[PDB]
């Protein structure tokens, strides 16, 4: 035995919720949602799949629904429920700044060392719940951490993530389309993926906020990397980091998985820099820097229904 998922996966009728505007591009729209008998309105994005013609793409969708229901952190994304019309929708927590590789490519010029590391922390917060949950991601990536404020992020995209058994040391893939310049080297070669694979690719993310969303190896091709990789080349120091800072990242490409830190550690690391953050990233201008009826609207955060 392993622990039942007791997880409830809430359906909701059509005419809970009304779509305001597109945001996405599969079609994503911000919109509000009213639970059924119940007086408060929850900004939502609702993703509504295109074709529904196709059984793989909603085992697809399902799967992430499965996923996103399975997990209740503050620092991962929250499922509010599934619509079952001829177009399966997911209903989400709207987070309206995006995602945190447009936001820090929008908002270089006004990000400060308080935001980045303590953005470092909360998704080391997320990762190590997931590792709680005995759950792999395979896709943390910049791109897949959502900004519901400028103080308050939350990991994304739950297609990739594998629920490891409870006898399963490594989850086995075999083909699609796979983030390499995000994966660590036992990935790449092997189809090998673990917590560390997750501190890998954690590693890598830290490294675009650093450089405020500079791509990792732009201009490298994908089938270089393992071989960059088994050479010993890593990713380079971004000018704001401090060696402290820096060798944390590296540390989380070491190519011994178990050398690698734990996200319980990032934590506590990122937890002591952020307590003196000009200490550890020197950005210029640092000290300087900031970022009908709308009655009954309350935040899907304080939006809870019975555990
Ligand atoms: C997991 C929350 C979610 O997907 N919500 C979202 C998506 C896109 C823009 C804004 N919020």
Request: glycine share 6%.
């Amino acid at each position: 035995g392993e622990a039942p998922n007791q997880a409830l996966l809430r359906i909701l009728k059509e005419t809970e919720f009304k779509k305001i505007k597109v945001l996405g591009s599969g079609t994503v729209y911000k919109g509000l949602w009213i639970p059924e008998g119940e007086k408060v309105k929850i900004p939502v994005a609702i993703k509504e799949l295109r074709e529904a013609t196709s059984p793989k793409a909603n085992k697809e969708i399902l799967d992430e629904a499965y996923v996103m229901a399975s997990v209740d952190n503050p620092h991962v994304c929250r499922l509010l429920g599934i619509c079952l019309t001829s177009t399966v929708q997911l209903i989400m927590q709207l987070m309206p700044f995006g995602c945190l590789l447009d936001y820090v490519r929008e908002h270089k010029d006004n990000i400060g060392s308080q935001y980045l590391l303590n953005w470092c922390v909360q998704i080391a917060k997320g990762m190590n719940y997931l590792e709680d949950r005995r759950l792999v991601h395979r896709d943390l990536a910049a791109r897949n951490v959502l900004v519901k404020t400028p103080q308050h992020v939350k990991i994304t995209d739950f297609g990739r993530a594998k629920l490891l058994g409870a006898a399963a040391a490594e989850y086995h893939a075999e083909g699609g389309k796979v983030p390499i310049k995000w994966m660590a080297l036992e990935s790449i070669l092997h189809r090998i993926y673990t917590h560390q694979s997750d501190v890998w690719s954690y590693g890598v993310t830290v490294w675009e906020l650093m450089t405020f969303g500079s791509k990792p190896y732009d201009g490298i091709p994908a089938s270089e990397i393992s071989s960059i990789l088994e050479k010993g080349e890593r990713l380079p120091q971004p000018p704001i980091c401090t060696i402290d800072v820096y060798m944390i990242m590296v540390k989380c490409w070491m190519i011994d998985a178990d050398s690698r830190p734990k996200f319980r550690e990032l934590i506590i690391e990122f937890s002591k820099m952020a307590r003196d953050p000009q200490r550890y990233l020197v950005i210029q201008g640092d000290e300087r820097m900031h970022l009908e009826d709308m009655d009954d609207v309350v935040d899907a955060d304080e939006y809870l229904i019975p555990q």
